[PDB]
């Protein structure tokens, strides 16, 4: 039987890293990409579908699962795994980004919001609430300084983080259940501040984590300055856990985190986008929406191994989502999905090889063009 | 290889049949329900998912498709069995009934009006149009006549489907590829009245047609009503031919209608209604999003075969359509079509087993208990 949590490291290749997962419910390869499966659906997808594309691991939200249908309501139901019929490891967010999204007063003690009925999230609450959904890997309760942000405010929000970061460490440890069949990862902060983002590092690491998460980036600063923190930043996490880069990103972001350090990444961009009609390629998106497409017979790409290419044509497609037709959104949605987990794959593989930076630059100049 | 068409009656109980029509696309076995798959696709479902809850044909809705995408848009693309990716056979409405439901000048020579851009639409257009479509059953154009309607009106209108039901004969058989590959069916009209049914039958046999609807049923008459037009018009029809009554309709109304002869169904009942959260059970059809169900474990219904039976609970599903979620609508409409299939299939057997008049007795008294 597998163990509760160990990270192998198969291959490097610079900053770049590929290998394995391995948890009770399953293996996760690495560098990874989770699905985001928000009131417990990825959007538009049976759970067997999102596993067909390649998916290993999905992401859960905390926020939302405690308003609709609620923590404890899941909990007397089985758990999450069993609700949605999913029974892979599931990643829970804290809550900490979302509430202070889409919901609230803020203290040391943790945060009180109104849905969009009043309700409260701590570090204490937020660890409780992943626990009754049964979540494999459990992410601390942070904040996530908004960008920009003043040196004086990145670092209160900072410590803050670290203090929740203690406190969430304690609570999962205090749960026996949780403790043995979970992981719980830690969240680094310190907006684009290098002094910063090494204390965070260095209190995370002191507490001790299972892995790794980069917060407080994908959050208005753009590429060049997401990857000028990440060149600094990802080198201060401990080496031989995995480091979880949270909300990113376009496939372009996903490459150049992995030549920089990153093993793990969620976004809602190809779930959304998708069912927006957006379409990812190899030779970067298309909007299917748009009327060069109402003819064409090619599949959304001429290379995608994924069931819609093989089955589908942009022009019906097309179709459908002019048409407002659900089954618009499940095949874009299918497709963009397993384009994502396409690239994560080649990303592996390249890395596997030695030959992920010329992957890279092979991937940009086609994607790009 | 199979014919163009042939069908052959294997049980008779009473006025039940039960049995197969063969066509070049495959075989459907009757009684046989048809999903509805309005705008080139069955909402909310891929089509190897309506394959598998044992759908032997589908509906296209000639009207829609004419608008969008467009026919010999469709026609330029392959065809609508390669363009959704259905390749059994299809049976395509004439576009009479939702060119006065849903867009109107009404003349002898057709009915023009408005997209809901301006078009046209006759016996000619609309065999056109079902060829361009690459239909197998083609419907002929005709004018349902509202209900109520004074006998004058009624016959009036009959009259003027049966020159349309000429034309359309005509029409389809002038186009060579179309009269070798595809069947005609034609509608019998003449409202509530015996004798208009019988003059309608009359003229519609001896133009002589592949298969025989009802039409003008379904539309505000109710059951008690339409079982007693039912009750004459259906022996008028020729016995060694498909009778198909067009949108009809919810359970029971497909068991007193095959005890009436009919061996054909469509309706937008399963998919429409799942979309908005009844689902039908063996027990009368319930409304997933009431409280009742916030944390049922149980299935849709406790005996249904189908894929989301065997895989969700009615807690997961009522949070699904509460919240919104596509998944929701998907899970809802494979089932309630399943349901549908299983009816049919619990039909055809006990007429093969000369124990209909039993099902249908205890059918009644279970759903309506
Ligand atoms: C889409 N961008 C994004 N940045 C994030 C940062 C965090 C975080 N906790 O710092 C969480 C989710 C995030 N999503
Ligand atoms: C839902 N009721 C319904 N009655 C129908 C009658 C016809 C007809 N052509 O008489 C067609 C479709 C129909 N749908
Ligand atoms: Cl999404
Ligand atoms: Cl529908
Ligand atoms: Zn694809
Ligand atoms: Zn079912």
Known sequence: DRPRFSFSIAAREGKARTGTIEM?????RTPAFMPVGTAATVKALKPETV?????DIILGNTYHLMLRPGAERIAKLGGLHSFMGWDRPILTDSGGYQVMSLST????????????????????????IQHLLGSDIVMAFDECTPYPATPSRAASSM???????????????????????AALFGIQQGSVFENLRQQSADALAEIGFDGYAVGGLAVGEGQDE???????????????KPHYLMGVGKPDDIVGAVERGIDMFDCVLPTRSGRNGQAFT?????????????????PLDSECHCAVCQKWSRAYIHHL??????????????????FYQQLMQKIRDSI?????????????????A
Chains 1, 2 share one sequence.
């Open 24 to 28: 009770k419910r399953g293996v996760i």
């Open 51 to 55: 596993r067909a594309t390649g998916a």
């Open 105 to 128: 007063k803020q203290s040391e003690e943790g945060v009180t919001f109104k849905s969009h009925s009043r309700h409260m999230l701590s570090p204490e609450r937020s660890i409780e």
């Open 159 to 181: 410590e803050r983080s670290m203090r929740w970061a203690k406190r969430s460490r304690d609570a999962f440890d205090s749960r026996k259940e949780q403790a043995e069949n």
């Open 226 to 240: 997401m990857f000028r923190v990440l060149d600094f930043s990802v080198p201060m996490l401990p080496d031989d």
């Open 282 to 298: 190899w030779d970067g998106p298309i909007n299917i929406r748009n009327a060069r497409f109402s003819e064409d017979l090619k």
């Open 321 to 338: 989502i002019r048409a407002g037709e659900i089954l618009g959104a499940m095949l874009m949605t299918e497709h963009n999905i397993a």
């Open 352 to 368: 596997s090889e030695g030959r992920f930076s010329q992957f890279a630059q092979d991937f940009r100049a086609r994607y790009f």
